[PDB]
Amino acid sequence: KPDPPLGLHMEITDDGNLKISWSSPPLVPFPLQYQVKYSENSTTVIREADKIVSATSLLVDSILPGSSYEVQVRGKRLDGPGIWSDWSTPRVFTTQDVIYFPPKILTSVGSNVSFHCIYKKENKIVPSKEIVWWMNLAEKIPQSQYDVVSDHVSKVTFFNLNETKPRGKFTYDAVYCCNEHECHHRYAELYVIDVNINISCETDGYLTKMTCRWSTSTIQSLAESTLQLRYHRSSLYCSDIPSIHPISEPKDCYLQSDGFYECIFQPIFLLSGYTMWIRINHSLGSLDSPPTCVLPDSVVKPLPPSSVKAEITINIGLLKISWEKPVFPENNLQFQIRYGLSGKEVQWKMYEVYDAKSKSVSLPV
Amino acid sequence: VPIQKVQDDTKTLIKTIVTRINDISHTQSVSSKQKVTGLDFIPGLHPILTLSKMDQTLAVYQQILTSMPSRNVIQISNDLENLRDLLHVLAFSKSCHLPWASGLETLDSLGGVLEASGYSTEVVALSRLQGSLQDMLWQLDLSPGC
């Protein structure tokens, strides 16, 4: 006789269905078949149903608003003449009076979001024609966005969504679906946060490591938010269109005094393209920043040329300027030179040398 | 895949690695061609006529460089990996099938030289690498074949 199932929980899916889950006992080395008796009690319809499932979860379609769900689960050994376990403690779940599905949406700027609602008036489902939508109880949503998917549920479609401005503490938009002029207290939460984070990578003068820096200016408005840099290393080069890869690696980034997070890759692959993005893991959901692919061999900063000597040619009168090409990069090089009168403020005259094999330039003064 | 761009990038990568070795002051003073006994396993200047030979040579160099603890060497190993990949894509553009070279099976001996004399192994390995890269760069215009 196995122990009764523990951890009986009931949750609401995004599709509007009631998911009942339970945990198998940790002392049974054999699979268990479960019998779940659930009763749905409304003011008009009372139903009882027993279902036998091999899995540890059960789905109930179209959970009714303002109804009480009482669930009991018992278990049995799947193989052989097992003994049925005792019934677990009944779990009671009480619903609200208006259904929004999905209740919350995490989206980005410019996306299209569809919200569906079912409105109940005295345990009666209002037809979709009477349903009127409002934004933050301020203004009525235009009827062009209104769509009737079915006679019981209404929906609204939002196209080319902009960033929701913060109104005080609330950073989301509350969308209300109502029976005509009279509205309900509950709503749907729309979170359009700014995920456009610019990451700039830069290699050292010896091309041994690459430090990538990114700012946190647009993410300070949200508390309890965790930011993690995720990168994927390709075998060769960067693709023309960077994209989020399912297999990615986290990177340890440290905040500096200037408010920028720096992440150091050492060693670095010169001709392997790194597709990087920022993953924000909220309490409900995870968002990814638009990924950017960086090739280290193309981000060559390195140190300006050394051994710069500025002399004046004898009996010629031309300012001869010489230098030494730095170790990196080894591509063809162009040079920019500013020359002026030495003083408290120097009027810099500009010159450009586009010859790669040029090391000394004579200029008139 | 543009063949010309890959070839030019390959050239630039070779010069880059050569310059890296140039930065290493102790390697510059050592004769590349000169023979030192015990290091013979390292693929030094011996005619590297073909792409498969180049691939196996680079594979061995990567395998040797991986074992030596040096920050510069790890980057050089990465550049060598990229160089091999470039050679493989070129071999594909030439309709050649290059099998992926394994490194030397015979590393059970390299440990001894690394333990007894690290300095000799490092200077020789670097100078011979630079030499091998230089002849490879010379031959890359001669229309290398498989």
From Swiss-Prot, chain A:
Q: Which subcellular locations apply to this protein?
A: Cell membrane; Basolateral cell membrane
- Describe the location of the Fibronectin type-III domain by residue ranges: 4-98, 304-365
Q: Where is the Ig-like domain?
A: 96-194
According to UniProt, the tissues expressing it are described as:
Isoform A is expressed in fetal liver and in hematopoietic tissues and choroid plexus. In adults highest expression in heart, liver, small intestine, prostate and ovary. Low level in lung and kidney. Isoform B is highly expressed in hypothalamus, but also in skeletal muscle. Detected in fundic and antral epithelial cells of the gastric mucosa. Isoform B and isoform A are expressed by NK cells (at protein level).
Annotated disulfide bonds: 117-177, 178-183, 201-212, 238-293, 253-263
Location of region: Leptin-binding: 232-249
Q: Which residues are glycosylated?
A: 41, 112, 162, 281
Q: Which domain of life is it from?
A: Eukaryota
Which modifications occur after translation, per UniProt?
A: On ligand binding, phosphorylated on two conserved C-terminal tyrosine residues (isoform B only) by JAK2.
Subunit-structure text: Present as a mixture of monomers and dimers. The phosphorylated receptor binds a number of SH2 domain-containing proteins such as JAK2, STAT3, PTPN11, and SOCS3. Interaction with SOCS3 inhibits JAK/STAT signaling and MAPK cascade.
Disease named in the record: Leptin receptor deficiency: A rare disease characterized by normal levels of serum leptin, hyperphagia and severe obesity from an early age. Additional features include alterations in immune function, and delayed puberty due to hypogonadotropic hypogonadism.
Q: Which family does it belong to?
A: Belongs to the type I cytokine receptor family. Type 2 subfamily.
Described purpose of this protein according to its UniProt entry:
Receptor for hormone LEP/leptin. On ligand binding, mediates LEP central and peripheral effects through the activation of different signaling pathways such as JAK2/STAT3 and MAPK cascade/FOS. In the hypothalamus, LEP acts as an appetite-regulating factor that induces a decrease in food intake and an increase in energy consumption by inducing anorexinogenic factors and suppressing orexigenic neuropeptides, also regulates bone mass and secretion of hypothalamo-pituitary-adrenal hormones.
Q: What is known of its domains?
A: The cytoplasmic domain may be essential for intracellular signal transduction by activation of JAK tyrosine kinase and STATs. The WSXWS motif appears to be necessary for proper protein folding and thereby efficient intracellular transport and cell-surface receptor binding.
Its name, as the record gives it, is Leptin receptor
The full protein's residues present here are 236 to 600 of 1165
Swiss-Prot record, chain B:
Query: What is the first-listed, main subcellular location in coarse terms?
Result: secreted
Location comes to: Secreted
The protein's GO terms of the molecular function aspect are:
DNA binding; hormone activity; leptin receptor binding; peptide hormone receptor binding
- Keyword annotations: Diabetes mellitus, Disease variant, Disulfide bond, Obesity, Secreted, Signal
**SUPFAM superfamilies xrefs:** 4-helical cytokines
One Pfam family name is: Leptin
Tissue specificity here reads: Adipose tissue is the main source of leptin. It is also produced by other peripheral tissues such as the skeletal muscle. Expressed by intercalated and striated tracts of submandibular and parotid salivary gland intralobular ducts. Detected by fundic epithelium of the gastric mucosa. Secreted into blood and gastric juice.
Gene Ontology cellular component? cytosol; extracellular region; extracellular space
- Output the GO biological process annotations, alphabetical, semicolon-separated: activation of protein kinase C activity; adipose tissue development; adult feeding behavior; angiogenesis; aorta development; bile acid metabolic process; bone growth; bone mineralization involved in bone maturation
S-S pairs:
96-146
Under what conditions is it induced? Induced by secretin.
Q: Which InterPro entries match?
A: 4_helix_cytokine-like_core, Leptin
Q: Which residues form a coiled coil?
A: none
Presence of the UniProt keyword Zinc in the record: no
Swapping residue 79 to Y leads to an effect described as:
In LEPD; no effect on secretion; does not bind or activate LEPR
Noted disease: Leptin deficiency: A rare disease characterized by low levels of serum leptin, severe hyperphagia and intractable obesity from an early age.
Complex formation: Interacts with SIGLEC6.
What is this protein for, i.e. what is its function? Key player in the regulation of energy balance and body weight control. Once released into the circulation, has central and peripheral effects by binding LEPR, found in many tissues, which results in the activation of several major signaling pathways. In the hypothalamus, acts as an appetite-regulating factor that induces a decrease in food intake and an increase in energy consumption by inducing anorexinogenic factors and suppressing orexigenic neuropeptides, also regulates bone mass and secretion of hypothalamo-pituitary-adrenal hormones.
Family statement drawn from the similarity comment of this UniProt entry? Belongs to the leptin family.
Mind telling me what this protein is named? Leptin
Q: Which gene encodes it?
A: LEP
